[PDB]
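ok so heres the complex, two chains, lmk if somethin looks off
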Amino acid sequence: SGRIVGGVWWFFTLIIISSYTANLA
Amino acid sequence: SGRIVGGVWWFFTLIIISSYTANLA
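and the predicted structre for the whole thing:
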């Protein structure tokens, strides 16, 4: 139950940090 | 106590490595 929360949050912050890196580039 | 240290340092190194990746890009 908490595992999928961790997974979804991880995917989310992944897309966000990748987006930040790309945009800053 | 150590939790916020790990968190802050994590955010720090995260933005720094993302910035490095972006600049090199």
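quick notes: Residues 6 and 12 of chain B are 10 Å apart (CA to CA). thats all i got rn
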